[PDB]
Amino acid sequence: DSRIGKLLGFEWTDLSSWRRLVTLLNRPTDPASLAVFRFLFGFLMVLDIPQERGLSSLDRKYLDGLDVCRFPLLDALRPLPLDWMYLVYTIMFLGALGMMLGLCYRISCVLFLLPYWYVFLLDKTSWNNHSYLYGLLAFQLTFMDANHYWSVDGLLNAHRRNAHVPLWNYAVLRGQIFIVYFIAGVKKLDADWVEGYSMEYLSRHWLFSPFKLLLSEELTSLLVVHWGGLLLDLSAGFLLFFDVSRSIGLFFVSYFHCMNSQLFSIGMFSYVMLASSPLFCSPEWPRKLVSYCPRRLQQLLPLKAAPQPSVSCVYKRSRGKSGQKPGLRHQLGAAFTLLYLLEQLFLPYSHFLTQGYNNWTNGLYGYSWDMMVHSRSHQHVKITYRDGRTGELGYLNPGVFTQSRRWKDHADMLKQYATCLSRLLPKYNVTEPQIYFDIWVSINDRFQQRIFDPRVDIVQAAWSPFQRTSWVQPLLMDLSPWRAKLQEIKSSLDNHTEVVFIADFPGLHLENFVSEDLGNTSIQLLQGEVTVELVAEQKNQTLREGEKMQLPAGEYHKVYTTSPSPSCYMYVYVNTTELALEQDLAYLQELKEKVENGSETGPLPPELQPLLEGEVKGGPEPTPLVQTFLRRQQRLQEIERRRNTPFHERFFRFLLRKLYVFRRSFLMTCISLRNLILGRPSLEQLAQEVTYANLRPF
Template sequence: MRRYLDAFITKLYQPCDPSLLACFRICFGFLMMIDIPQERGMSRADATYDEIPDKYCTFPLIHGMKPFSQDVMIILYAILFLNAFFIMIGFLYRINIISFTVIYWYFFILDKSTWNNHSYLYGLIALLLSVSNAENFMSVDGFLDRTKLNTDVPQWNYALLRFQVFIVYFYAGLKKTEKDWLTGYSMNRLSRESVFDPFRFFMTNDQIDFWIVHIGGFLFDISVGFLLYFNKTRGIGLFLCGSFHGMNSRMFSIGMFPYVMFVSSFIFCDEKLFKNIIAKTVVLNHCVSTKACDKNSSCLYDESISSKRWKPNQIAAALFTVFYISSQSFLPYSHFITKGYNGWTQGLYGYSWDMMIHSFKNQHAKIMYKNLQSGEIGYLKEGVFLSGKRSRWKTQPEMAFQYAVCIREQLKKFELNDTAVYFDVWKSMNGRFQQRIFDHNVDLASYDWSPFKQPNFVMPLLSELSNRREKLREIKRSLRNVTSDYDVVFVADFSGMYLENFVHQDLGNTTIYIMSGEVIVESKDINVTLKSGGNLKITQNEFHRVHTVSENIASYYYIYVNTTAQFMKKRLNECEKYIKDCDMLEGQGTCSSFDQSNEANKEDIQHFNPEITELYAREQRYKQSLHNLTSWNYFKWFVFKKAALFRRSFLLAVYAMRNIVIGKPLSVDQLQMELDYLNEWMTPRRFQNSIVNTKEDPVTSNVGVKPEL
């Protein structure tokens, strides 16, 4: 046993060149500087953390955990940003990387509703860098302390990072062995993205969705870690990583994740790669030393291996390596222990590497409360008491429980001291029927939730209906072939339950069709029993209920047409035709481009109401923006947007520091002026002007109406 332990520690402490690790440190710090104002939320921290305590519901991992005051949270963001900058340049590296790691994980634990696999990965990388010697090359610390400059680092510094990158890919591939992914139901309609245009020469969109997105994605994830590990296949792995993450950066708004993963793939290369590149670069070669590394007392060299007397720090590093590898190998499959977080999917989203395995479509969510003293029932707007868009509570049972408890506490402010809270949430997962996810008869605010007990208020996923998904696609295709104005919603419900639905007045010709089971459709004027194959037209602008009375599950679907949108589309086409005719005849004096002084055109102006002309103007401006969106304009827009986020983040930090040191201004006018100054670069018009360099709106000049964005 001792012999194996000696060999293990000896391998971990083999000396390695620090240059590649330093390159990774520089890139990570730089990318985090870009990520913090945007994805981490620094630029919108004033909206996320309100000045009024407990104004919004939050979803911390540790129940009862509360954020600090608004100004303190903004200052923490500013410190996090400065930490990232100092990590990049390697100044006071150990202090800054530990500070970055602690603050980052504090923000991460504080709000589960924003968890993603990539935000979890950033925290893990920060943790690994905090115990590494990444400052031993190209760092300010190295220039200030020559004993650190260009000195070896132990092999385990690289080994843990390589393991982490490998497991992200490999476990993502293992998660994709799920049937929904391998049969092509997880990521529908992704083939419409422009990055797949080269494949469209010889493949249909459905073939791209299945073979490229699903099968290709599975093969990439399961194999690319091995391709990167071996020298002979590393070039292929790097090419595939560059292509894959480049496509992701264009398709998804996932911040710096594609760039972090692409940079991370180079950690598998030879440790001297970065130093060799510097040696071949004339400018850098004169600034950075590329000579052989000095020895590091933490590493094991040939003359020190025979001693077999391990230092405490060497044993601690070996134990940490074993613990980290074991925990990260186990956590993605630990959901049989943490049953309280399991719903239709296993565990909380964000640490299992099950990236994009499940796609959800939300039909509606109804929040109902009941005054237990008076029996009065009331309804709340979806998303009430939440800051911004927080929708993950609709799929995660533990977050639904937290939200229900928070709503009950918030209602106490309105003298409703004893209430029950019920959720009726309808969702579709991976192209299945819309179905309720929570039992709407269970008071979630009073539920006895435990992290180790399966929540029994979660309704089971109707997997027995999964084989009907192809039939659902056929119905959609048949409708699409007839007209694009119709839409369809598929619903399945449990025996003894009912769906309460409201048909908006815009949805004309709404009809319900029964696929299986037996239901009773009940409204103000009707009470009709329908069986498989039956249908009924639903009255607009009123509620109706669909009771499932059969012993088994009932499935049905609605077909409807948005008559208002249909009418607007028709009038829009007429408006567009009229304006084009005016442009063609303008030179002959028969059209005055909507000149309202012309009596002949007044009737036309009334014919096309302002909503129509505004809609047409917006569409034309959008088309013009796309036409002018060259690569250079896209780059300018990207830089302008990032500059606006950085500007707002910086100003928030300045105002927060001012508020803490000398106090917040009492003048409402001054506060409003500061808010306007904060948002000056964030308006859509400023973004549009950064792309479309036109002094005159060609649509506005034709239509005679200047619509707002």
């Protein structure tokens, strides 16, 4: 009766005592919305397993006999052989199907949960917010009585057919979605989001075309893309709960998720959020929808009658009987709800404890809900090793013995990579080494700067989870406003020249080798004091502010920083070889155009004859210029043909590619299951089956 009770659904007196709280959290509620959400979640996970979890690509990620540097959260965990991995993914698929159909619900949830977290904890490089959300939702649905309506288990058991469920099943899910929206919103209250730096280039997508009718691009990229996301996060957190604002909230949230699905390649996350959005509606909407159909549909759709009493709810007895005393499962459910929501609120801000994982950003990516907040651009990665026996110094391929590229931004992954290299290099005639890393990275278009000290042996370095790392360089926030001026310098260049901005600590130095092609390269100092040394003649010059030097091409040079503060400078270069090739190509293009339009009546040179013929048959091999010209022309024609493609063909190719992925996954799974059960046949049969599996559908 009270307005507060109507708006929030519970009275204040309900919270006076623990028993009343348990009764409130275990009141009866209709199950239909939970059943619909369970069905949709199961369907989306079933579609997601063969695409993003990597079942199609799992034959080239956990291959037996290959030497790879893993990145697990615990060093004890190691991958199983390939066949057991495919068995694990098969168990995942069966669990997802069981959840979708609600057959043996608890067993299916367990079989989906344990393998999923086993795969998730095995590799830190595949972590991301929408996988963590799937894991959490699978964990929550394991305990909820979501099989009470529109489930095969209902047909096999009368007691669990169209039955009541306690309210906390809905409460936990609503709390989870609200926490996602609110934590994402507050995390985007950062200087790099409210100012327009993060996601600066997404406003050019054609989906934002109508907004450009009334706004300029610069305002369109700030008011709509950035501020709109924050406002929608907070509002969609709040609006959906109340009845007054539910329609507008649903409309905006649906538009937001559809645009996110089209712009990005996040995967099934947008559809999962769309499936979760109706959950804030009244719990009985599928039932009234089923009621509003003809009788013929009602003979096939789920039941419309009122739900029956259950045993997993505290029933208020109005017959004069004493109220049902809450047992154990009700108290356990209430405690689970409160503790789980408190833990979910606490965990995103728990970075002050696990300081070992801290970096320029906060903690490992995945469980902070900071989506599309930081963009990074790597420039160079140098890995040096010194042999412990002879003393030779050498350089390694930066991406050796690895499958991901997130180790350039986390100290712990760097340490694991160093240990892996230490164990593996003795196979390549190298004794106990000392490894040094030098990585350059810029976040949100700042000065490119070192992230780890290049003078520290990472193999013997010190690292623990709960102490700050002593060899991670700080991020210089004092140079932030320069992002204005640098952008102006980016707009003052020609179509050929290029610029790279560098900032360096005192004491350190950068050694570089300009390639012979990059002639006409210059270095200019913006702030600080630096000294540029040429080793060809061993000559070092000290550069002051606003001075420019022309560096040699094809030689080694060094820059040392000799100021109390960090020094910022800039390389400006042009590629001479590409320019000369372009001029020659333009000259050749001009010559063919003169030949075609009737000018240049004189006989063509022999080297030009292959261009008109277009085929090398019965003649000398073409010169490199002719080959490059023909390759460019063919590439341009291929791109032009690709652009001129109708929609239906693109849709058909998309469907065929997806069907190929599904078929390959299924066939590989069957082959490996046969190998496990009936043993491994001869090599020729295995080769034949593998060849058959990879065949395109056509």
